[PDB]
Amino acid sequence: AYAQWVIIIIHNVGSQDVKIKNLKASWGKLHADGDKDAEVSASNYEGKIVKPDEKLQINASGRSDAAAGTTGTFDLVDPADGDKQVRHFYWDSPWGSKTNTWTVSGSNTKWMIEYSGQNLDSGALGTITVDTLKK
Ligand code: NA
């Protein structure tokens, strides 16, 4: 359902490009900013470069009137290092479960990543802002 939703905002706060890769929603839809009825393909974001101080926004929700939520993953990768993984990201805003999940994994000590805004207890996962910086 549309009540299961997440907004992921990637903000590059450093001086080196970061890149989005392997964006895949396993449950639900990706949709346009502020319009859950406008479903969009992950190719609108796949491989996109986020330049210094730029931002990129992904919106995902459950499908309308579906007893199912939104679940997906994506990578941030380093376009100056052979698209080496920076971090791996997983989101889940389930239907009928009170625990939402936002999990960052992987390791790359040249990069630092900070996120906030998530809601883990009941309802939608919320609007998560992810700051990236190459050290
Ligand atoms: Na949810």
CA of 122 to the centre of ligand 1 (A): 6
Beta carbons of 87 and 76 less than 8 angstroms apart: yes
CA of 97 to the centre of ligand 1 (A): 7
| Torsion angle defined by CA atoms of residues 86, 51, 23 and 2, in that order, rounded to the nearest 10 degrees | 120
CA dihedral for 33, 36, 41, 42, sign (positive or negative): positive
The beta-carbon contacts of 52-56 under 8 Å, at least 24 apart in sequence, are: 52/12, 52/13, 52/14, 52/15, 52/16, 52/17, 53/11, 53/12, 53/13, 54/11, 54/12, 55/9, 55/10, 55/11, 55/12, 56/9, 56/10, 56/20
Beta carbons of 78 and 18 less than 8 angstroms apart: yes
CA dihedral for 45, 64, 71, 119, sign (positive or negative): positive
Experimental determination technique: X-ray
Tokens (6 digits) for 76: 């941030």
Give the 3-state DSSP-derived string for the chain, with helices as H, strands as E and coil as C.
CCCCEEEEEEEECCCCCEEEEEEEEEECEEEECCEEEEEECHHHCCCCEECCCCEEEEEEECCCCCCCCEEEEEEEEECCCCCEEEEEEEEEECCCCCECEEEEECCCCCEEEEEEEECCECCCCEEEEEEEEEC
Beta carbons of 122 and 2 less than 8 angstroms apart: no
The single residue listed with the structure tokens 């926004």 is: 57
Q: Which amino acid is at 124?
A: A
CA of 104 to the centre of ligand 1 (A): 18
CA of 123 to the centre of ligand 1 (A): 5
CA of 26 to the centre of ligand 1 (A): 15
Structural domains in the chain plus CATH codes: 1-135 (2.60.270.50)
Q: Which amino acid is at 58?
A: I
What is the rounded CA–CA span in Å between residue 29 and residue 59?
Answer: 8
Tokens (6 digits) for 127: 């609007």
Resolution (A): 1.8
Give one word for 85, left, alpha or beta, with left for phi > 0 and alpha for psi -120 to 50. Answer: beta
If one counts every other C-beta atom within 10 angstroms of the C-beta of residue 20, the result is 21
CA of 125 to the centre of ligand 1 (A): 6
Beta carbons of 33 and 68 less than 8 angstroms apart: no
CA of 34 to the centre of ligand 1 (A): 17
